[model samples]
Target chain A: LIVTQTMKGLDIQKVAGTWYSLAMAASDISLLDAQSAPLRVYVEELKPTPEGDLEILLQKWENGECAQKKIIAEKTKIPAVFKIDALNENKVLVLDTDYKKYLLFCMENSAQSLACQCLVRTPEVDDEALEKFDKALKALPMHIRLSFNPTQLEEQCHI
Target chain B: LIVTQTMKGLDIQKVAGTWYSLAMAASDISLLDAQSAPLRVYVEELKPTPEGDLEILLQKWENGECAQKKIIAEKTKIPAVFKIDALNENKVLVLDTDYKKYLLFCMENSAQSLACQCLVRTPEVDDEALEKFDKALKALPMHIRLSFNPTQLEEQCHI
Candidate 1:
């Protein structure tokens, strides 16, 4: 949902690294209750294609097992927005990032609400990164209905 | 301390109202030790100034007695950055806010660690906010020695 703003000039290549889900916010009651239960933990790695598509290696816990999906974020005229054709989601905001430590992604046009995917480079996110993660979310143009915690979700990122 | 960034363009008028300290991260071990112990409640309020400085009315429990300090946050070239000259402190960052509900303020260049103030407009701050609040403190450039919880440090906001 490209409302008033979207981040710009992302070096998707620099952003390419092992990233783990840190938190999310949504309006759906189910997603709200799910609250980092580990049913689907989005531990993803993004590698930018030579042509600008994002090679998304999504890792998650599915039915007592770890699962993976190789999806790509197609480029758009908007420097910070992309379309995840496989996920059937559109207008995905790359949000913000420091590349080395954390990145934030949001599906602004989610059927239910603005679903944000917060990821970090390390298994345990330090307070500063966590603080920036949420602060960046707060800057979003929506009322925050729910927020997630990574520890309880526990994706075991190191392995 | 000079961190890479701080918040921008805060509407102090909209930000005016009741506020309660939900959490804090500081360099001083005593401040960390003094985390929301009910020994003192940092429930505060802000009123606009004719000079445009923020008239910070601080109310905390001093040995269970309500003590008040009227400090002013002198505005700076940076929008949300202020100097609490009355408190003899410089470089106050009002980190994050919803204007009506939550506010985060920090003293980055303290003798100890960067001192942070996490506050909410309501007495009851939910678990989701608390979780993000702590995570944000972790994201700071220091090893978070302490944080605040509004539950135990409850204060009557409107009175």
Candidate 2:
């Protein structure tokens, strides 16, 4: 699935790298460093959807352990696209995920240390899969702030 | 300035919030986590160079003090592109930071732990910058791999 926009195209290669975690908020900053474990990582494998949009699946492995599998819900292509926000002097890349709704900092190779905090509901009209997304976000630290509208369906749809 | 590409874009915001600092090379990784005198965090700014490439300026506060300023040397933009050498259950983003290289594993925001490792430089290139980059890669603990071609610059220049 390909999502086109008026903005200039983003080179996936240029934005790839290791990023550092800054802050996270759900209700409060509780699990800043909850586990010393490393989060699994994966890139989106774009697939065609019925709505003429693309579907993305992100995956990762838990530490060096292959037993634990954590998979985030698939996000549909929407108005807001993925982007590289900053490339720090340390050579870190700061990413703006989900059209600015979430932030990710990455470095090429580092031990895992990322925790989720808040749960924000996705658009109810077109996306029912996002319901679980809220619960996933709430399991982490409380300080990471996530905003979502419960009533608005089309505008908040994941795709 | 915007750098465009024809591939799928990774969300920067999501990447930033989910980043974890892995092991450090020259120093103890735990040193950054000291509570009484924690390592200071700074948001470095990125700019577009005259050559239409991106450059990053590192700015951080000195000591525990908040006001002092430190400026690291400006990195050339030629080496700042992101590359994905492999794709499977785990997606890896390879970054080239001058003489150093890093690998970032992409994961969901909810996953608390992420793996990061420094890369080893190819023995073929003896350039000072390449050697420094190799040293930097060996300093981390994350496990990701990449291919390097210093001579590619010369090829591009001919184009």
Candidate 3:
């Protein structure tokens, strides 16, 4: 049984800020491979919409050039579950988050594949945040957890 | 605190059939008034998509004629909660349902206003289905419960 719980009473306003990708985990390891498509993204901001949804601004390296992607995450009956329209429609879960320090989230695509990411306030690693990340990974049995290269992303694109 | 729970392990295939609106309740009473816009809808079918979502086919009387509206209700991590793009995006919840007899669902709009409907297999009133409808109404305190005239809708449209 894959048990994933979303945080209750998630305050989007407090969660709206700059975030650096600290770690990423995927059910298919090929997605995280260096030669494959960009898996890690630098989240610029999470702006709350008037409709009580979140508009996410993300920057990623594509075709050796930095590209920006904006996504609208529509809120569901479950507060932490959002229906995101990415390249395709996906179900997103804010698995866990603390306004001040770290954020752990997951996305389930049409193929039922899972991809999760742990984001931190800074590029520097924190033990407490990693502990939080490990707790989420326990639920995903087939996930391969990998570290993100924030310095490489920052050097390529300084936005 | 409003406690609205969705049905667990909802099978969309069993739910995909013709249905008649039996009762409706809305937080805003004006939305249900006779002089207002179309409130009751005749559900044609709930076709399941390849992505595990549902494509809803509905018929409603608009501008003194029958108008067919097709909507895609995206599935979320929560089985019974769906994100539907109607006039605007709204959160839909399958509060309660018995595949053979009745289906009770609710939709929460952008303004946070709620509108719930109880659908039955036939136009005729059934005490068993009303019992299920009344159970759902208890959770919504400010809701103005009203009856849906299936005859009126049928006379205006044959499809």
Candidate 4:
């Protein structure tokens, strides 16, 4: 008989700290509110890329259950950028993501609480990295994809 | 049998240093030069007024001779006020009498030089002190009278 071992989810302790948002689009943008909300989402796992960069797994409580996990964009020597249009007690609008594309999110609290709209071109991703993100996204209920011109994005987030 | 002692001029130290003029004026006000020709006189002797103020006896070199004495205006709580004006090359200006007048002088090359134009309009001396000043003035040269204020003039000089 032959046996094999598989890697488990990345350890949370490795990425439990502040991280920058590089870009964002709609729907997915609600993650900003969840991340920046009262009890911020702490990084629960981190994996290092072959180039010594980072990929983060962020976890936070939605309602009373730890039912949400966000696959943070790949880390570069340069940090992520984000734009926040409006945030208050009632609503939040955010465009958060890595350097390449914007993911806009509108999030509120209720049954219709969380909504995200991600705008991304065919972002260059390694086969393994894409597989990893697909596994992470499978756990979520809603998914939306949009495309954007990389040249149209600004160099930094305008709050 | 009786015994007596005699004292000459007031025992005072000459503040050996350079001085610069801050301001100057004669009876009706003459040419006022704030730069390039600030009066640099020397303190030859200093005496304390009866009211515990300082009286500086200032003399300028007139062709290698102690020319004349003029009382400076302004009372300084400190032993010296150094370098009155930057234009005077950091020369010290000192107050001779308790009055609102001053003597500006400086020491250079082991000799003292007088700058120009004594300033006046100081408080009047008391009658007893005025009498003592009269006695001391009598011993000085009659030509020296021209240098001092006429309001304090006396006929003779006594030591």
Candidate 5:
């Protein structure tokens, strides 16, 4: 993945918590729908490494079947820039964030054949958070063909 | 300590390595000279922890004694602002860096009577790195009475 820019000033502190996957989009048709059918959940937490690496542990489970996965990401100098060895080396950008309500992340790949991007949100109060999410998308490096189910995003998960 | 701006874009990957303490200084008379008394040795290595916290293993031996300390710092939204628990909540500003040669660090205390700072260098080839080092000092939020010996900053230690 290629990035011309990343989040300029990001606070890893505020964004550290369980974030539900709101919208997920992929270049391949199958990748997109697979996520659509599953009730996605992310148990996310951020910590710091001895060498000042911002490490993020993302645990995901599909449909409560316990297909547990842990993907670790190291923070970079650029805001929201991280190298998740598990994520195939495309620089991850924290496109925009308010920290409390909604945050946007855009994972970019230079070639459209490998595009995989997603954004997640907490159940923060108020509906205007959707506007904040859309504004972030407009600012992305490339417009993504996103498939989102507002009902799914708003739905509460038991886990 | 307060930061108007932290290290906006610090690349820890390049900055990770064993950093030799070139010069140490402080407002307190005792702490200032105590550091000077020792012929310092540092075997610093940056590594991540199980949780994503920046772990700094600062191994310093002075006057032939070891005070092996490990510090845990958390990354903030703002780059270069690290909250080191060992520093009593004093924010550690990764003020300046070239990463390969020398880097400047400042631990700020509210009162002028309490600031302490030092610079580190790797055995490198060049005289101009001093200019880079000094320039970082001038960009500091407040001026600290730091006296560095060019000879000391460059002196190589036998590991």
Candidate 6:
């Protein structure tokens, strides 16, 4: 959901880790279409740089190849809000996260592109994570929710 | 809360354990009055009997003495609803429980006595348990909410 309020007192350090995508939603349904497959990003890891910024590593499966992308999100005055340095006008908000279990994040850009995702520390999506994602989904405008197929991404980037 | 529905698929055996009082509320304000001291029961344990019923052990402080009371709740067709056979016309509902951490329960009798309690497995209450308790407390009518003084009950029933 494009929530006006983000998580309170988010410790960026504690949120750094590998995260597997559980589900995703976007304001524009076309971002979920095959034509926009590359934009269907699945977060691989969130690493905190020594400079206190967040480094996000994402993967996308496209044209029978696993493509990797990286973005650096600069910490804003608000603890849970960050500006994506790579996509100058884009920002990501830490909607909610328990650190140990799951993360809920929303990304919005100057052009009005909006997307939100639920990421888990493990392959299985727990009830709490699903509930948070579903609740966020309920508040979106012009959106469609999609669940990631675990099997399709299991062996990605494999030798 | 006087919820119309109870926990789904409640496994009575899993809920058996020692529980300490955290907070309580009721439809009748007098139950929380100092004059009605003995009525302020603190559940100590919930045990599943071999006959597939529930045994509740509670303690109350009265006249500088700690008194223990036992009530056998007969299993009804509903997994979370049981008839307190000892009270004859009273029923106890297992509103919610995570088994390992906390439990929320309500008791309603034919005499119109209604009360609800939030109990924890440990002395310190977690956020989820407190949130559940507060939410339930908000739903009561003609009610008063009271938090148990942990220090006052710590040494109860000591020999």
In order of appearance, the predictions have TM-scores of: 0.44, 0.21, 0.46, 0.17, 0.37, 0.47
- Name the candidate that leads on DockQ: 1
Worst 10 residues of 1 chain A by lDDT: A27-36
DockQ score of each predicted structure, in the order shown: 0.03, 0.01, 0.01, 0.00, 0.01, 0.01
lDDT of 5 at A62: 61
Cα lDDT tens digits for candidate 3, A12-56: 778887787666666643344332234555577778787779888
> Which residue runs does candidate 4 get wrong by more than 4 Å?
A1-13, A16-112, A115-131, A147-154, B1-159
Candidate 4 TM-score, true structure as reference: 0.17
Kindly give the number of clashing pairs for every candidate.
14, 70, 0, 57, 13, 0
lDDT of 6 by residue, A1-159 (tens): 245648998999999998987777666535653323435687889999777799999877666777787888988898898887653578889889999999999888765677788889987636679678767655555233455444533655311
Q: Could you list the iRMS of every candidate?
A: 12.3, 14.6, 25.4, 45.8, 27.4, 23.6
* Candidate 5 local lDDT, B1-159, one digit each (tens): 543434557875566656755533333323322332222223365654544456777655464655676777776665676666643455666766767666666565554433333445554423454445434543332211323333444433322
Candidate that would win on lDDT: 6
Q: Order the numbered candidates by TM-score, best leading.
A: 6, 3, 1, 5, 2, 4
Q: Model 3, stretches more than 4 Å misplaced? A: A1-3, A35-38, A86-88, A157-159, B1-159
Residue-level lDDT of model 6, residues B1-159, one tens digit each, is: 245548898999998888887766666444643423435687788899877799989877676777888888889899899887652577788888889999988888765567788889976646678678657645544233445444533656311
Docking class of 4: incorrect
The list of candidate 6 runs beyond 4 A from truth reads A35-38, A62-64, A86-88, A157-159, B1-159
Residue-level lDDT tens digits of model 3 in B118-159: 778776766677677767765563323454444543543322
Where's the lowest-lDDT run of ten residues in candidate 4 chain A?
Answer: A1-10
In candidate 1, how many Å is residue B20 off? 20
Clashing pairs in 6: none
lDDT (CA) per prediction:
0.58, 0.26, 0.68, 0.30, 0.48, 0.71
Cα-lDDT of candidate 1: 0.58
Top TM-score model = 6
Give the alpha carbon lDDT tens digit for every residue of B85-113 in model 1.
63446677776677866777776544544
lDDT score, candidate 2, position A83: 24
